[PDB]
């Protein structure tokens, strides 16, 4: 991977736990690295997340099979244990496999029902999500959305609030209330925080959000009769491509789940129409030819660009 | 755009006027640039031609809407007046938009029912088409042909006459009458001219006399050709316009006028379409894509019947064209 | 072309003679060069192999037609004789074509029912195939296989024997017999030879093979008094793409032919599954994604990589 160290050392969601069943092999793609995810058939077995590559002759291990707590390459049958060490070369069954016979392994943790991966050296914890432990809140997951846009443009779009009346009219916006009041934004060691903001839907909700790290956002909305939170997680496939997922929790009736998912789906697809059209693909930082213009209601998206530059992000941006 | 200045400062057709209704938003591409063409809902409203790009967050303005004689970006609703100046930012409705909030605008003229665009500073006039105002002549437009070939190879193939008996058997030639007489070619202050040339066509109607077509053409600029043909009963002229999408891709259109019966329009359009598609089969195949000028594949060979296509290549070098050529 | 002179000056198969009937026009691609193959309508006419290019206005001659003993370009009807000389320019029927009016022609020989081409100046003869002349041997031909992999990776995969029990189980091995004996490998002026080797399916066969040149392999298998030999010929389309063909001869029953053809098709498709997945695309050579690992049963594929470097191959390898 050629991503910046600041990106390499963070945790990213790559899958839902429910999709990584015992005995299964699945794949993902993170910061330009192809990943294989596997579990032994044993109940409660851990998830291994490795680079999807057999170092013998360069075959994807995801093309193999899980047997007896090992992942077995399809080409010459080399067997790799849970730690990624080759323990058996069938052509030479009494030989001790060379030390180089070892899959590239990465850090993996399950949290909030999601599979989190760190390709580097974890310097931080997985982002917090306080309502996960609050049994007054129900939970639901959106499907995943594959987006042909930089992961930082994806997050930029979700920090933006002034677009609501124009592409989310009815759910998040009112074309008769397109004015945007003064925004409160802070960037510090807790990350990027937008203060409480009044949303007009054509009722009136109060919204705020925080990003402790650049590609995960915690979003909180209070309506009249209900509070809705979510954890937005962007998988940075590479500089130009993203996966998007939401874990949503709410303290109203359980029966609202389908309507919530439907509203999110409508809004997300409205945003994707814009995201797929933006040029340049990578997010421009502060300094397809004219440079970006910023107005006061861009205060939070300007702060996001400033934050990325302070962090040293060069991957997925321009 | 890496196009040469001599190309940037010229006029090119990007659309037919009749396909650009009031209130409409049309996309096109020219010399590597993405364009948006829009009109207000007022009748006889002019056509604006701008780079298709909102300078706020980089969204195509063509994804927006036309309202109150402005083009409105879909993302945050900034409204751009006919001059391309942002006159309204909805998030801050009492704020004067910054002077930088301005679309890149280009020159547009309507002429002969065609939308002409100049991306630079118009040195030249739009090419002349004398029959346009002659009521003895009817008019028709071909469809637009999208061609995966350099615009200069598209025009090279229209200047070429010796191919007629081989890929246009019937409408423009016959394979047993393939010899090419000496050609009159001039490159001068009027551009490139091929003088009157006898075209030998295959007979179709056995009751009638030979067609005995005499053709000539002139290019005052390198991607527009004025073509004139006298046949047995009538004169047919056309204006051929090549849109240089980029170095390797072209749109081709003809405006055709004739002083015979209006009822011939179907035969004319079908004959043009048959010939054009025969030419496209060759154009798509030619390598290198870009037109070789005079100087790993071997060099082009030239014979006497290539006099006008050689002259075209020499003219392009004189003009300084480097874009779409090699 | 950017291919090495050592590759340019060798012979490659580009077609089966059965693919090129009298009067036909066919295309092929070799070392980056587009080829046209044509024959006059006469009985037993020779095959011309030229660069697929009319030097007048750059049209592929393969879009033309064969007329008399000439290939006629579709655009302006220039006529090229069997030597590639333009003999008629129809616009100027009494004019002697300029000397430059000439197709680029290549060396071509038919041998073993295959069309061999040398783009350069051939320093070697076409490889030997002793059984061709033996009336005790029947012959058959596989179809041609277009493979999105380097021609040197295709040949590497056919030199590899330890993969037999894992991707060719039931034809060339089985997983209960995966151990690989000490291999006999020699590289000298004859090229690369693998000495006789036991193949499992007693239930066993004896195999050996030899490459006089890097992209053609002679292979010999004996089992139950029947012998099967083949000539494997790889067409190096460019650095990343190959055509694969086999000429097979055997001295058992004629009725084995469809079974032989079916077995080869299964094995080849089993190999293509692996070949298409391998990264990098080009064959990695030895060094003086992690680097390849080599174990004793890789002795002959290691020797292949060593040979290619010693020959100075840079095209299709890394
Ligand atoms: N973390 C985030 N979740 C999304 C949900 C969408 O809400 C609904 N109801 O669809 N809520 C919200 N205010 N936004 C604004 C940007 C993005 O759509 C999002 N950010
Ligand atoms: N400006 C041009 N219009 C075309 C028409 C086609 O006429 C018909 N009847 O199909 N006439 C003509 N002589 N040619 C030669 C090249 C190209 O097809 C063209 N040039
Ligand atoms: N020259 C070669 N021909 C092929 C045939 C395949 O045999 C069958 N029966 O399909 N025989 C053989 N031993 N191999 C090993 C590699 C490659 O499949 C091949 N090499
Ligand atoms: S490539 Fe994986 S065992 Fe050989
Ligand atoms: S991107 Fe056009 S108004 Fe914001
Ligand atoms: S391009 Fe082949 S004869 Fe003109
Ligand atoms: Cl297991
Ligand atoms: Cl729940
Ligand atoms: Cl961070
Ligand atoms: Cl993050
Ligand atoms: Cl309007
Ligand atoms: Cl305001
Ligand atoms: Cl050699
Ligand atoms: Fe949105
Ligand atoms: Fe033509
Ligand atoms: Fe194999």
mmCIF file of C-alpha atoms and ligand atoms in Angstrom, chain A residues 54-59 61 73-80, chain C residues 160 278, ligand 4:
data_model
loop_
_atom_site.group_PDB
_atom_site.id
_atom_site.type_symbol
_atom_site.label_atom_id
_atom_site.label_comp_id
_atom_site.label_asym_id
_atom_site.label_seq_id
_atom_site.Cartn_x
_atom_site.Cartn_y
_atom_site.Cartn_z
ATOM 1 C CA UNK A 54 0.257 -16.754 -1.770
ATOM 2 C CA UNK A 55 3.988 -15.874 -1.742
ATOM 3 C CA UNK A 56 4.969 -19.133 -3.509
ATOM 4 C CA UNK A 57 3.714 -18.388 -7.030
ATOM 5 C CA UNK A 58 1.457 -15.389 -6.500
ATOM 6 C CA UNK A 59 -2.040 -16.962 -6.459
ATOM 7 C CA UNK A 61 -5.407 -17.269 -1.202
ATOM 8 C CA UNK A 73 -3.710 -22.391 -1.347
ATOM 9 C CA UNK A 74 -5.338 -23.955 -4.440
ATOM 10 C CA UNK A 75 -2.196 -24.133 -6.580
ATOM 11 C CA UNK A 76 0.306 -26.279 -4.651
ATOM 12 C CA UNK A 77 -1.742 -26.806 -1.489
ATOM 13 C CA UNK A 78 0.492 -24.931 0.958
ATOM 14 C CA UNK A 79 -1.328 -24.705 4.285
ATOM 15 C CA UNK A 80 -1.309 -21.538 6.396
ATOM 16 C CA UNK C 160 5.670 -26.874 -13.003
ATOM 17 C CA UNK C 278 -1.400 -14.694 -10.866
HETATM 18 S S1 LIG D 4 1.114 -20.565 -5.293
HETATM 19 FE FE1 LIG D 4 0.276 -21.057 -3.348
HETATM 20 S S2 LIG D 4 1.070 -23.059 -2.882
HETATM 21 FE FE2 LIG D 4 2.063 -22.513 -4.753
#
